[PDB]
Amino acid sequence: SVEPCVICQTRPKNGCIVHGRTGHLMACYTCAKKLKKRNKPCPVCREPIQMIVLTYF
Amino acid sequence: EPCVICQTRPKNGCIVHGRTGHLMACYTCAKKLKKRNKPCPVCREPIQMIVLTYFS
Ligand SMILES: [Zn+2]
Ligand SMILES: [Zn+2]
Ligand SMILES: [Zn+2]
Ligand SMILES: [Zn+2]
């Protein structure tokens, strides 16, 4: 999607939530860290945030 | 923004090296690069890991 981060609605989607061989790119990196830090699941699949990847194009 | 290699499939292959990832290629072209021991196209750094990427 060409939309911004689902949480802050301002920063770009650059926080790949990675769980196994798939990642879910919906949030910015800082909002993705905030979810993981507060022990929140992946917004898309509600599966635990195994790791977060600062994504660039 | 199609895959830079096959110019057809979407960019869904996150080349991951450390905590940063470079999203320029599709997953199957990204596998092909890693398989053949080719570096990351963007930074020419080793492909540690490839991630099939999907949006919300
Ligand atoms: Zn955000
Ligand atoms: Zn997920
Ligand atoms: Zn491709
Ligand atoms: Zn790279």
Side-chain angles (χ1 to χ4, degrees), chain A residues 1 4-10 12-20 22-25 27-32 35-37 40-57, chain B residues 1-4 6-18 20-23 25-31 33-35 37-55:
Chain A
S1 297
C5 169
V6 291
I7 293 133
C8 63
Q9 302 281 9
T10 175
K13 324 193 183 273
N14 58 350
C16 201
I17 286 150
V18 178
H19 31 39
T22 70
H24 281 134
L25 192 38
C28 82
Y29 186 74
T30 58
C31 290
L35 284 175
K36 162 132 149 180
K37 282 253 198 157
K40 287 214 127 45
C42 181
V44 178
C45 56
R46 298 226 96 172
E47 284 268 67
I49 304 162
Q50 195 170 107
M51 83 175 297
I52 306 158
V53 179
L54 188 53
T55 303
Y56 282 121
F57 314 72
Chain B
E1 283 199 330
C3 167
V4 171
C6 63
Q7 301 282 10
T8 174
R9 321 193 88 215
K11 326 194 150 148
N12 57 352
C14 202
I15 283 152
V16 179
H17 30 39
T20 72
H22 281 133
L23 194 38
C26 81
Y27 186 73
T28 58
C29 290
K31 279 187 81 247
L33 285 175
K34 173 169 226 217
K35 243 149 211 269
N37 253 302
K38 304 294 138 266
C40 181
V42 178
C43 56
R44 296 278 292 244
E45 227 58 71
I47 306 164
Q48 304 207 355
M49 189 188 195
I50 304 159
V51 176
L52 188 52
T53 303
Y54 282 120
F55 304 74

